Scaffold this motif. Structure first.
Motif, PDB file in Angstrom:
ATOM      1  N   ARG C 142      14.182 -11.727  70.159  1.00  0.00           N
ATOM      2  CA  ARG C 142      14.943 -12.860  70.660  1.00  0.00           C
ATOM      3  C   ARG C 142      14.140 -13.573  71.737  1.00  0.00           C
ATOM      4  NH1 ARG C 142      20.139  -9.574  72.726  1.00  0.00           N
ATOM      5  NH2 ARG C 142      19.768  -8.640  70.661  1.00  0.00           N
ATOM      6  N   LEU C 143      14.133 -14.898  71.685  1.00  0.00           N
ATOM      7  CA  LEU C 143      13.658 -15.707  72.804  1.00  0.00           C
ATOM      8  C   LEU C 143      14.845 -16.324  73.537  1.00  0.00           C
ATOM      9  CD1 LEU C 143      10.438 -17.848  72.544  1.00  0.00           C
ATOM     10  CD2 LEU C 143      12.346 -18.794  73.842  1.00  0.00           C
ATOM     11  N   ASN C 144      15.450 -15.566  74.444  1.00  0.00           N
ATOM     12  CA  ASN C 144      16.644 -16.043  75.116  1.00  0.00           C
ATOM     13  C   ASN C 144      16.530 -15.951  76.635  1.00  0.00           C
ATOM     14  OD1 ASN C 144      16.757 -13.250  75.262  1.00  0.00           O
ATOM     15  ND2 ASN C 144      18.913 -13.113  74.666  1.00  0.00           N
ATOM     16  N   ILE C 145      17.543 -16.576  77.251  1.00  0.00           N
ATOM     17  CA  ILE C 145      17.855 -16.561  78.691  1.00  0.00           C
ATOM     18  C   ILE C 145      18.597 -15.231  78.950  1.00  0.00           C
ATOM     19  CG2 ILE C 145      17.730 -19.027  78.959  1.00  0.00           C
ATOM     20  CD1 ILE C 145      20.875 -19.033  78.916  1.00  0.00           C
ATOM     21  N   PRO C 146      19.029 -15.054  80.204  1.00  0.00           N
ATOM     22  CA  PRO C 146      19.863 -13.910  80.580  1.00  0.00           C
ATOM     23  C   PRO C 146      21.168 -14.063  79.777  1.00  0.00           C
ATOM     24  CG  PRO C 146      19.018 -15.029  82.526  1.00  0.00           C
ATOM     25  CD  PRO C 146      18.716 -15.915  81.355  1.00  0.00           C
ATOM     26  N   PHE C 147      21.895 -12.971  79.575  1.00  0.00           N
ATOM     27  CA  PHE C 147      23.076 -12.985  78.703  1.00  0.00           C
ATOM     28  C   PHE C 147      24.261 -13.926  78.974  1.00  0.00           C
ATOM     29  CE2 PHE C 147      27.106 -11.441  77.106  1.00  0.00           C
ATOM     30  CZ  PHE C 147      26.854 -11.229  75.764  1.00  0.00           C
ATOM     31  N   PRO C 148      24.674 -14.115  80.237  1.00  0.00           N
ATOM     32  CA  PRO C 148      25.852 -15.008  80.339  1.00  0.00           C
ATOM     33  C   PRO C 148      25.552 -16.507  79.949  1.00  0.00           C
ATOM     34  CG  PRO C 148      25.241 -14.297  82.481  1.00  0.00           C
ATOM     35  CD  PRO C 148      24.362 -13.515  81.538  1.00  0.00           C
ATOM     36  N   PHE C 149      24.281 -16.904  79.774  1.00  0.00           N
ATOM     37  CA  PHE C 149      23.921 -18.260  79.390  1.00  0.00           C
ATOM     38  C   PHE C 149      23.355 -18.346  77.977  1.00  0.00           C
ATOM     39  CE2 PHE C 149      23.111 -19.521  84.094  1.00  0.00           C
ATOM     40  CZ  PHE C 149      24.471 -19.694  84.279  1.00  0.00           C
ATOM     41  N   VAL C 150      23.308 -17.217  77.245  1.00  0.00           N
ATOM     42  CA  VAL C 150      22.686 -17.114  75.918  1.00  0.00           C
ATOM     43  C   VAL C 150      23.265 -18.113  74.927  1.00  0.00           C
ATOM     44  CG1 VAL C 150      22.706 -15.542  73.891  1.00  0.00           C
ATOM     45  CG2 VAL C 150      21.673 -14.851  75.984  1.00  0.00           C
ATOM     46  N   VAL C 151      24.578 -18.369  75.012  1.00  0.00           N
ATOM     47  CA  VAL C 151      25.249 -19.342  74.151  1.00  0.00           C
ATOM     48  C   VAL C 151      24.627 -20.732  74.283  1.00  0.00           C
ATOM     49  CG1 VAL C 151      27.099 -19.574  75.898  1.00  0.00           C
ATOM     50  CG2 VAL C 151      27.489 -20.359  73.552  1.00  0.00           C
ATOM     51  N   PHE C 152      24.227 -21.124  75.503  1.00  0.00           N
ATOM     52  CA  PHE C 152      23.494 -22.372  75.702  1.00  0.00           C
ATOM     53  C   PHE C 152      22.158 -22.342  74.974  1.00  0.00           C
ATOM     54  CE2 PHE C 152      26.389 -22.203  79.311  1.00  0.00           C
ATOM     55  CZ  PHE C 152      26.893 -23.490  79.324  1.00  0.00           C
ATOM     56  N   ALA C 153      21.414 -21.237  75.118  1.00  0.00           N
ATOM     57  CA  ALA C 153      20.201 -21.045  74.332  1.00  0.00           C
ATOM     58  C   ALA C 153      20.516 -20.964  72.847  1.00  0.00           C
ATOM     59  CB  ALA C 153      19.459 -19.790  74.791  1.00  0.00           C
TER      60      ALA C 153
END
Ligand SMILES: [Ca+2]
Lengths: 478, 88, 153, 233, 51
Positions: C142-153
């Motif tokens: 995964r290329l993501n942000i921290p978890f509480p903002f993952v939906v934005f990513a």
């Protein structure tokens, strides 16, 4: 020996007496000299007058000489008569071996040992080589027995039978040296039978399974697969050839390379026998009958019958048990009659050793408590009898439920642990011995210190035995 | 405490010993159940009594070449195994 | 665990049905069958010692005489209004059950756990660092942000 | 009479395994005596072991004058009691006059050997021509006569061992003097009865033997392990 | 010396067992011995060996 042979050879008249040369080189252990100077040139032999030197080499323990003789030719059945057997068992058979044989017959009787006791009673007063192999093996000769064993046809049967005889003769407590060497030779021949049958299976499986089932014209009146059982040669059955044979006999027509949940799911849905989910490799009505004839699924049907029987007995015993027998009690009586017929059929096909296994003993005991419950239950209007019958049925349901442990020993997963469970009785008995000693020593002391002259027998055992027993589960006598 | 936790230790030691003999004794016991289930020619169990009546029906009315062939087969690998002993 | 549960279920049923059949008479409520056959011999694994078998410590304030209220039925009475069940058949039954489950069958599970821990320890590190690959790959996939903002990513 | 020591046992078992692995015929004397008996035994063993995959071919060639019971048919007969061997799958018995005549079978045998030696079958790595190997391990006149009748023809591919009677005198020497003093030191007990007027002819036989020594090879004593028969042939 | 390996060997153990049973042979089962202890006039019967 070499000096006496050089003087015996250079007299220049007894050179034609090669028999005297061979007898001289037989009384001494000159194998290489006789082989190099008697049999090499192939100028002289008859293959028939070699019998006196043969008998001398047999009775005086010359295994390399009889090997060199059989390498150049003699037929053993031509050599052996009944009179030679009477000379071997009457004169050359030792008396200490006879004493150990009779002590072993008095303490440890078995069908093969009964057979060898009958034949030694025969020959102290049609399979020649097997009887000579028996005479070789009870003497602990250990090197002539190999020489004759290499000449036999039914080799694995002979090895397993010799291992059985020597394991039974190794249990005699006097003359511990002979018991030790018979134990050594028994381990040797069970290893030999295993290591021969692994090759006979690892070349051609079908002919190996042909080998396993033949009686060989009443060798000892038994079979090759039975001799390992009767000796408890459990390493011969633990090998993958006999296990593959038993598994292919167990599944029957179904191939082993299908998953068993498909098999029980096809057992649950009966018209699903005609579908491509199970392989019947090893027409459709033949598929139907070959399914309902297999041992695996008839066992898996009988266990479902047994669980349904336990549920019916529980419903009758707890929720519907009146003065007159209702319909489910009569259905229950019919099912117990079917189980009774099956057990008495197993007793009639088994005989007296049926009472050897404790599970068959408690099955017969449970059926007897069931009919005792019936004959206490039918005398109506006596509430004492009608309650005592139900008490007998409860104490019988305990037995019929504890049979289920023995039923489920066939599983690959639960099975070995249930078999392991019976190796624990000595630790349980040691625990119970020490706990009973501490129980009595505490209970009598506490009853004597607290109270004074109890005269009621019930309140002796409720206070001496029962409360220190409850103090094992963390009660702390109050 | 002492007498129960000693029983735990003796159980643990006995489990430690008998496990390599466990599979041998289990698949030795497998033979007896296979033979006692294959000794019978019967129907499923709730109808066995009828098949038992069939046997009562019975009680109401009532050297070889391939042997030596498979023994002669056996002797070949016997000699092969004797060579395999004396070779090593 | 499955071997322990199999043996304990067999002893549980074989004791519970026998005790329910010896004490009482024709329970018609399904809930008080399974509370007295299954549940109380289950509690006897944690050291409870099933109470209804002593015939001296049995009071009739916990009975019903007929299935009308919550409580279990009585043991079936005499013509002298006394309990009928023998103490000499129900006291040793509870003793044998309590020995066979609370001591032998639990301390056998301890021994089998100890043997299984004895085997699998040299395979344990291998299987753990084999499982390490899957979590490393599913977190690096995964290329993501921290978890509480993952939906934005 | 024939003594069969276990080295020869291993050699001939390995030989018949080779003859099964290559699909070869074996030509032999074909009687019920000693070596031919044991060759028939190993033929029967390799037949009973595998039961298929080129059942091997053993032709015995006998003299017809030595056979005890002889039954003329066109209709199979039963042969019980020289004696013929049971386990050779083909038998050829040469015809002659009266009975007591050995060495009659050798002429047709060696002529057949020369005919296969000139017979060409392309599916082999010999350039066709069906390669032929002759063995000998024992003693007597007939071994020497067979080896010399083979080596006088081209391509016998003679292989001998270093074990036997004549096998020793052929193996050890590799003119007349050495032939004499090796023949008397290895075989006195047959030459005790034999006149020199044919021993000079034997020296002529061995002189024709040692002409083409490339067509003769030997299995030695240190060479006694496995695969020694393939390494010779 | 507390040389307990010298006494653990089967020769001294065989000596001690043959001294322990005494007149009774070791190759009889011990339940016969205690059963003959319980029934005193059963000493004269062929169930135990006094070799
Ligand atoms: Ca049974």
């Amino acid at each position: 020996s070499y000096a006496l042979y050089k003087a015996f050879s250079t007299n220049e008249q007894d050179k034609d007496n090669w028999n005297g040369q061979l007898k001289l080189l037989l009384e001494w252990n000159q194998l290489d000299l006789a082989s190099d100077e008697i049999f090499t040139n192939d100028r002289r032999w008859e293959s028939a007058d070699l019998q006196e030197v043969m008998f001398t080499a047999l009775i005086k323990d010359r295994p390399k000489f009889v090997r060199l003789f059989l390498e150049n030719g003699l037929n053993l059945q031509k050599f052996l008569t009944n009179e030679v057997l009477t000379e071997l068992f009457s004169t050359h058979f030792s008396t200490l071996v006879y004493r150990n044989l009779q002590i072993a017959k008095n303490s440890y009787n078995d069908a093969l040992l009964t057979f060898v006791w009958k034949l030694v009673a025969n020959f102290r007063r049609r399979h020649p080589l097997q009887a000579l192999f028996i005479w070789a093996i009870l003497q602990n000769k250990k090197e002539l027995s190999k020489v004759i064993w290499e000449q036999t046809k039914g080799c694995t049967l002979a090895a397993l039978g010799a291992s059985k005889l020597l394991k039974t003769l190794a249990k005699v407590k006097n003359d511990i040296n002979a018991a030790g060497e018979s134990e050594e030779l028994a381990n040797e021949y069970e290893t030999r039978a295993v290591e021969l049958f692994t090759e006979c299976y690892s070349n051609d499986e079908d002919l190996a399974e042909q080998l396993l089932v033949y009686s060989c014209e009443a060798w000892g009146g038994s079979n090759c697969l039975e001799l390992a059982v009767e000796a408890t040669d459990q390493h011969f059955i633990a090998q993958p050839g006999v296990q593959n044979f038993l598994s292919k006999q167990w599944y029957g027509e179904i191939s082993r390379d299908t998953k068993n949940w498909k098999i029980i799911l096809c057992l649950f849905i009966i018209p699903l026998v005609g579908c491509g989910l199970v392989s019947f490799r090893k027409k459709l009505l033949w598929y139907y009958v070959a399914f309902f004839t297999s041992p695996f699924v008839v066992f898996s049907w009988n266990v479902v019958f047994y669980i349904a029987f336990l549920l019916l007995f529980a419903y009758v015993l707890l929720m519907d048990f009146h003065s007159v027998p209702h319909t489910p009690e009569l259905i229950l009586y019919a099912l117990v009659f079917v189980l009774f017929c099956d057990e008495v059929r197993q007793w009639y096909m088994n005989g007296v050793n049926y009472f050897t296994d404790l599970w068959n003993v408690m099955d017969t005991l449970g059926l007897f408590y069931f009919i005792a419950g019936i004959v206490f239950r039918l005398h109506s209007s006596n509430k004492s009898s009608l309650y005592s019958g139900r008490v007998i049925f409860c104490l019988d349901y305990i037995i019929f439920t504890l049979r289920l442990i023995h039923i489920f020993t066939v599983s690959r997963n639960l099975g070995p642990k249930i078999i392991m469970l019976q190796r624990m009785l000595i630790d349980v008995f040691f625990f119970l011995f020490l706990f009973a000693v501490w129980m009595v020593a505490f209970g009598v002391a506490r009853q004597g210190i607290l109270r004074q002259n109890e005269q009621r027998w019930r309140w002796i055992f409720r206070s001496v035995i029962y409360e220190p027993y409850l103090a094992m589960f963390g009660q702390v006598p109050s | 405490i002492l007498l129960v936790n000693l029983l735990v230790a003796m159980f643990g030691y006995t489990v430690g010993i008998v496990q390599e003999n466990n599979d041998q004794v289990w698949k030795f016991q497998r033979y007896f159940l296979v033979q006692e289930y294959c000794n019978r020619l019967n129907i499923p169990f709730p109808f066995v009594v009828f098949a038992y009546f069939y046997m009562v029906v019975k009680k109401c009315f009532k050297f070889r070449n391939e042997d030596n062939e498979t023994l002669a087969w056996e002797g070949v690998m016997k000699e092969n195994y004797l060579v395999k002993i004396n070779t090593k | 665990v499955f071997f322990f549960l199999f043996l304990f279920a067999v002893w549980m049923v074989a004791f519970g049905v026998a005790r329910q059949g010896i004490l009482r008479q024709n329970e018609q409520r399904w809930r008080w069958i399974f509370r007295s056959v299954i549940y109380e011999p289950y509690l006897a694994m944690f050291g409870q010692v099933p109470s209804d078998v002593d015939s001296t410590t049995y009071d009739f304030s916990h009975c019903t005489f007929s299935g009308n209220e919550s409580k279990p039925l009585c043991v079936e009475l005499d013509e002298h209004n006394l309990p009928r069940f023998p103490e000499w058949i129900t006291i040793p039954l509870v003793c044998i059950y309590m020995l066979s489950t609370n001591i032998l069958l639990v301390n056998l599970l301890v021994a089998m756990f100890g043997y299984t821990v004895g085997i699998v320890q040299e395979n344990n590190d291998q299987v753990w660092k084999f499982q390490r690959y899957f979590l490393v790959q599913e977190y690096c996939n995964r290329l993501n942000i921290p978890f509480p903002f993952v939906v934005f990513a | 009479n024939f003594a069969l020591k276990p080295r020869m046992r291993k050699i001939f078992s390995r030989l018949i395994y080779i003859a099964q692995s290559k699909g070869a015929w074996i030509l032999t004397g074909g009687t019920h005596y000693g070596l031919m008996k044991y060759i028939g035994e190993v033929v029967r063993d390799n037949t009973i072991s595998r039961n298929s995959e080129e059942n091997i071919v053993a032709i015995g060639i006998a003299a017809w004058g030595m056979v005890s019971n002889r039954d003329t048919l066109i209709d199979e007969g039963h042969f019980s009691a020289y004696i013929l061997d049971n386990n050779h799958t083909h038998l050829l018995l040469v015809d002659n006059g009266c009975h007591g005549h050995p060495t009659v079978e050798a002429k047709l045998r060696n002529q057949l050997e020369k005919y296969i030696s000139e017979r060409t079958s392309q599916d082999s790595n010999y350039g066709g021509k069906i390669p032929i190997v002759c063995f000998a391990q024992g003693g007597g006149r007939e071994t020497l006569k067979a080896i010399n009748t083979s080596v006088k023809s081209k391509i016998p591919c003679v292989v001998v061992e270093g074990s036997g009677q004549i096998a020793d005198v052929i193996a050890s020497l590799v003119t007349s003097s050495m032939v004499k003093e090796k023949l008397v030191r290895f075989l006195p007990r047959t030459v005790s009865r034999l006149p020199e007027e044919e021993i000079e002819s034997w020296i002529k036989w061995l002189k024709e033997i040692l002409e083409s020594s490339h067509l003769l090879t030997v299995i030695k004593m240190e060479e006694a392990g496995d695969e020694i028969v393939s390494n010779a042939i």
